[PDB]
């Protein structure tokens, strides 16, 4: 029967004894609720999930918070099924711990909505797209030089103070206003201040009334540092699935994900892999970002921050995440303290869908021209610092000329910056600013300043511009 | 209670072991009551060591377990032509299931030292680079080694679609591939046609790490019947690599103790017991053939590692791409510093064994000559004309995607990159010259083609040159 | 049926197995038969693995061991102001007992991110180079990281004395300290008059493992209580690598599992739990705060290690004490080349936030050109220039010991530093030229240090020039 009972307490692992021939299956959730039936215990609450069959009719299971005050003896009722997550347009605007239960104070759930399992078989091989699309995000630099794919996975660096949340709430507010897509941040392993920083922004900038956030805090245990990613993935799915529209999928960190696995395996007992890492991290990851896909009535793009430890590419979680990204994307300080925003770097930056089978021939020879031409002035920077532009030939000064207007007018006006500016912003198709970025590199706009590349968006607001100071 | 149908104990990270079952052989096929299959590693004193082939999710402890009485077994036959399956031989996308009347043991042993015999027909794989500095015969098993994102998969999708023609059956082995990337293979491949001669056994990264580790051994099982029969096979393994980690993976959860990089010891017999079925049988076990070319993913391009050393050991020869090439846009670097086909040479023709030669000297020279010779114009002696005609050959080096061509062409264009007829056009123009060179061969060239195709040796080079002059009339320079 | 008994099996390094004690709790409180305390692990099936929290000599296979049914809790109040005591709440300095009459578990959730709110109040070090480079907002956890003999407790012993003015509530928690050090340190924190508003926490290097292991979780327990009654409080620890090193005794000596350099699987949850606990409250909790300042050795300047990495990735950020300008003699000799703060920015006063930005530039350009000062070929209008900027910001950096410097006299002399009025002073007489507009300040700059303290912000600057003018005159060059 569902009735089982406690054997033994190793830390955030505990272990079940239930009836023979009544075991649950594996990854199944399991609930304590006690009450202290006197003045030498303690209320306990705790949910757990079955990982391992030890046999004897014992379970070996891990623990989803503190484990303290726990007796030999309690009852342990089985739920049946892997955890369940409340979906649909309930869950947008809210904030969920790892087990669906918000955490704000907007109150709870009712008990009636549709709930779906965490774990889940990856979509069949049938149902996949059978061709590569390219999702227009209306960010300049970033449709031109690294496009997005629909379905893909995008990299991104960069460290603090960078305009990484504001690149993130830009990317937000785009797609649900040019799409009709969701979003859902999944916080895996953050800092509490911080994110409760993020969702203060979020919230003032009125980006959350579409989105629906899962946090994970730093102090939780491992088991819930590794189950609130497949809990925002679920949380995905449904959007994907049943309403049929493209949807946005973050995760704050996936080598602390990684590090959480590592952290479970150990306190499992099975030998470390290569680095001391758990030996199904691949299969771990693999389970993770195949469900990140794009089918024939949705898609799943997802952005992932990475963090490299001690700075070592050929670290084993670096490159196994790299085995998956198609695109990358780079802040840097110095584009930061320049006028320029969103400081994203335009050579460190790169992907997969910049060949002339998906973007087309005419969108690559232009990205490829930008490319070489910023390349060049940065080669002649170093000597002119020292030299002065004197020793510059006519042609060197004409491509530092238009290699200044280009990397300024890289930079864009967003949405998200109206609250300290008041720029309506812009949202800058892609046709529009190829045949913009041609038309400069062809010198037809070289005599206007460079002040008027700054923060436009569109070519005709550049004009207008230049018009206005005259 | 008859203990010839066994019942699990243990159930955890997709290794089950069962108590009973008698009568089971090492490697004999065992099913569940879901319907997974399953191996029997381990046969201790009283309980079996099982293996699970699929999703472990539902097997729970006190299952009933039963025996099928067939060791590792796939489905072989000439119906698999066409079909994606996993590597346990059913199929995957869709389309109805598969008539298949025979099968044959995973492992098997290879051919015998007097079975073999030397190779010595070329195999075309339709990219000029390797077919001109790196040439591959037909029982050869060749590494080709680089770093992410280097046009591998490129080179494998290239070499397929080339044998439209040259009656060769062929099977794509993706390992730990994205199901999204494995779609879009497919679907090329069938917008080229090739999937009238072509199968793909797939293993993504969601699937158990047994799966991954079978999926090479399911693949050229399925490549040894033809082979046997009497016909010829190109076999491409995906990543080695993924192979050796999920074996790693499944070693260590089996407690077995590792050794260097945590790999267990029996990594080099795991890779070269697969390996070693590629051979070119004698001409009285039945002229077959069956030639590999697995890839190995490297970090940083550092051949020193232990995987690519032992695949290096193994392998006739290594085919490098350099990653810093990839950024231009070329085809990456065939870098003729450390490719080496020690096998081959003798499977080139002799049309194409005449030109290599001076295209190695050639591509030495300008290699050698580095920025510091590029560097000023004091270089006024015949090392100008090194430089000019180096950048020739690398400007005709480099290819299109999905862009087959013919040997015939291939000897062409060379030859004339040799003798001078390139040494006045400007590099720019290479390209286009290439393309009206081949629709004036298409167009006129017909007796050249046909010798060339027909005997396997050079024409007339009065007659060559004199095409080739009247093709340079005829055209334009930009 | 013994439910609240138990007898000992095996006993040996501070680690005891008993039987029985069906009904305890983990994490409990248990009392030998000869009154030494100690608290449960590990629940098996037959043994309850019992780690001991005393001198364990006295304790004998067979001793009969008792139940509390007290989860761990550890006294607070006010009363242990200005005390020394040991993590269990019993005083070590004599001078009588204590006078708690409530207890909190050690164990407790961290407040909600719901109840958290940015940080925007300062935190005054007085230590120049950090309070304008790197500075701490109340709730922030900054780790201050540097090799032996570089001054680490020096800083420490600055700002909690630095505290005496303001409404802050200090605790120390000297983890595996000599008794020696902590005995000096108690009396010179005694002299200066910090005992009135200060608790300090002791653990030495002779006490068993565990107390160790929990000096940190009394210390945070300790000030949570006046987090919540909605004071400011401040903490401090040294040796978060020894009580990892502690804790990975404990669990090794109860037979857990190992992981990386030994440590145990959960050494992350546990430094996260402990200093996920400090926070800044937000106004419907009574606007409490709780900053950490944690202290971590490497040997060698080595952070590659894991514990300081484990550390590092948990705080806000980090301050770099450098082994080599120690020895040369810069004090505090921080290294703002790598020290960062992520809070920084909105952590400091308008009137600091107005001139910090300028002094970080110029520090950032002279950092970078150390080498230029070798020889005077320098090129002389930037590059010299720079190199005096870098030579006066640097020995006007410099501080000595146990004199923490007010927030306003802190930023008019580096207000005056940045406007250049001190190119003129020779560079070896700066710290004299410091000392005496301290001194002059003192006489007549009420006015301005009145200003700046009522209104965080800059005063006139005609007048501010003016008065500097007037010291600058009548200042006296050596």
């Known amino acids: 029967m569902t009735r089982g009972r406690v054997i033994q307490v190793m830390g955030p692992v505990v272990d079940v004894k ?298 084993p979680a670096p490159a196994t995440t790299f085995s998956h990204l198609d695109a990358t994307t780079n802040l840097e300080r110095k584009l930061a303290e320049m006028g320029i925003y969103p400081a994203v770097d335009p050579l460190a930056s790169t992907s997969r869908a910049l060949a002339p089978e998906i973007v087309g021939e005419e969108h690559y020879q232009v990205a490829r021209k930008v490319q070489q031409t910023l390349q060049r002035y940065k080669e002649l920077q170093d000597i002119i610092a020292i030299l002065g532009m004197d ?13 200044r207007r280009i990397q300024f007018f890289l930079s864009q006006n967003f949405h998200v910056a109206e609250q300290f500016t008041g720029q309506p912003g812009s949202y800058v198709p892609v046709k529009e600013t190829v045949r913009g970025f041609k038309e400069i590199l062809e010198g037809k706009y070289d005599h206007l300043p460079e002040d008027a590349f700054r923060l436009v968006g569109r070519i005709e607001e550049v004009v207008e511009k230049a018009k206005a100071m005259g | 209670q008859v203990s010839d149908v066994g019942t699990v104990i243990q159930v955890g990270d997709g290794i089950a072991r069962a108590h009973g079952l008698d009568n089971v052989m090492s490697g004999e096929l065992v099913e569940f009551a879901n319907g997974v299959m399953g191996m029997a590693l381990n046969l201790e004193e009283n309980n079996v060591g099982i293996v699970i082939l699929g999703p472990y999710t539902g097997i729970k402890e006190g299952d009933e377990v039963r025996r099928t009485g067939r060791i590792m077994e796939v489905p072989v036959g000439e119906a698999l032509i066409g079909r994606v399956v996993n590597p346990l031989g059913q199929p995957v996308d869709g389309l109805g299931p598969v008539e298949t009347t025979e099968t044959r043991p995973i492992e098997s042993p290879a051919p015998g030292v007097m079975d073999r015999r030397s190779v010595h027909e070329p195999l075309q794989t339709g990219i000029k680079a390797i077919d001109a500095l790196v040439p591959i015969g037909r029982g050869q098993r060749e590494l080709i080694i680089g770093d992410r994102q280097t046009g591998a998969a490129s080179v494998a999708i290239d070499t397929i679609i080339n044998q439209k023609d040259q009656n060769m059956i062929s099977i794509y082995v993706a390992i730990g591939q994205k199901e999204s990337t494995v779609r879009t293979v497919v679907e090329t491949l069938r917008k080229h046609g090739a999937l009238d001669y072509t199968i793909v056994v797939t293993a993504s990264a969601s699937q158990p790490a047994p799966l991954l580790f079978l999926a090479p051994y399911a693949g050229v099982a399925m490549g040894e019947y033809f082979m046997y029969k009497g016909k010829h096979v190109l076999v491409v393994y995906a990543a080695l690599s993924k192979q050796a980690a999920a074996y790693r993976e499944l070693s260590l959860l089996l407690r077995r103790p590792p050794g260097r990089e945590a790999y267990p010891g029996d990594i080099f017999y795991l890779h070269s017991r697969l390996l070693e079925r590629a051979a070119k049988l004698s001409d009285a076990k039945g002229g077959g053939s069956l030639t590999a070319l697995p890839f190995v993913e490297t970090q940083a391009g550092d051949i020193s590692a232990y995987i690519p050393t032992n695949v290096i050991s193994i392998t006739d020869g290594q085919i490098f791409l350099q990653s810093d090439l990839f950024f231009s846009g070329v085809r990456p670097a065939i870098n003729a510093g450390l490719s080496v086909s020690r096998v081959g040479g003798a499977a080139q023709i002799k049309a194409m064994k005449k030109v290599a030669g001076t295209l190695r000297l050639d591509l030495a020279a300008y290699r050698e000559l580095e920025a510091f010779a590029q560097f000023g114009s004091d270089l006024d002696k015949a090392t100008q004309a090194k430089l000019a005609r180096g950048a020739r050959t690398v400007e005709v080096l480099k290819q299109d995607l999905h862009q087959p061509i013919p040997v015939e062409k291939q000897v062409l264009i060379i030859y004339a990159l040799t003798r001078g007829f390139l040494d006045d056009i400007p590099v720019e123009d290479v390209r286009r010259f290439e393309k009206e060179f081949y629709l004036f061969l298409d167009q006129n060239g017909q007796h050249l083609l046909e010798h060339i195709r027909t005997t396997k040796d050079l024409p007339n080079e009065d007659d060559l040159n004199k095409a080739i002059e009247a093709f340079k009339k005829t055209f334009v320079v930009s």
């Open chain 1, 18 to 315: 239930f009836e023979n021939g009544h075991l649950p299956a594996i990854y199944n959730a399991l609930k304590i609720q006690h009450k202290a039936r006197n003045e030498n215990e303690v209320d306990i609450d705790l949910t757990l999930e079955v990982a391992l069959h030890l046999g004897d009719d014992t379970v070996r299971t891990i623990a989803m918070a503190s484990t303290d005050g726990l007796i030999r003896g309690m009852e342990v009722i089985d739920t049946g099924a892997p955890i369940s997550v409340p979906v649909g347009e309930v869950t947008l605007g809210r904030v969920f711990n790892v087990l669906g239960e918000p955490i704000d104070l907007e109150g709870d759930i009712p008990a009636d909505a549709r709930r779906d399992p965490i774990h889940r078989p990856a979509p069949k091989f049938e149902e996949l797209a059978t061709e590569v699309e390219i999702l227009e995000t209306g960010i300049k630099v970033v449709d031109l030089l690294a496009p997005y794919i629909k379905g893909g996975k995008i990299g991104l660096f960069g460290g603090a103070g960078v305009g990484k949340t504001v690149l993130i709430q830009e990317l937000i507010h785009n797609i649900a206003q040019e799409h009709g897509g969701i979003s859902v941040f999944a916080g895996v392993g953050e800092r509490t201040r911080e994110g409760n920083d993020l969702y203060h922004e979020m919230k003032d900038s009125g980006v959350i009334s579409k989105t629906a956030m899962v946090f994970g805090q730093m102090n939780e245990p491992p088991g819930a540092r590794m189950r609130v990613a497949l809990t925002g993935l679920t949380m995905a799915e449904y959007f994907r699935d049943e309403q049929g529209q493209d949807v946005l999928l973050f995760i704050d960190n996936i080598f602390r994900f990684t590090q959480a696995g590592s952290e479970v395996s150990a306190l499992l007992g099975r030998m470390p892999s290569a680095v001391g890492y758990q030996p199904t991290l691949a299969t771990e990851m693999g389970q993770l970002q195949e469900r990140i896909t794009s089918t024939a009535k949705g898609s799943i793009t997802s952005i992932q921050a990475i963090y490299v430890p001690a700075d070592d590419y050929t670290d």
């Open chain 1, 391 to 403: 020793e510059l030939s006519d042609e060197d000064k004409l491509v530092v000329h238009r290699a």
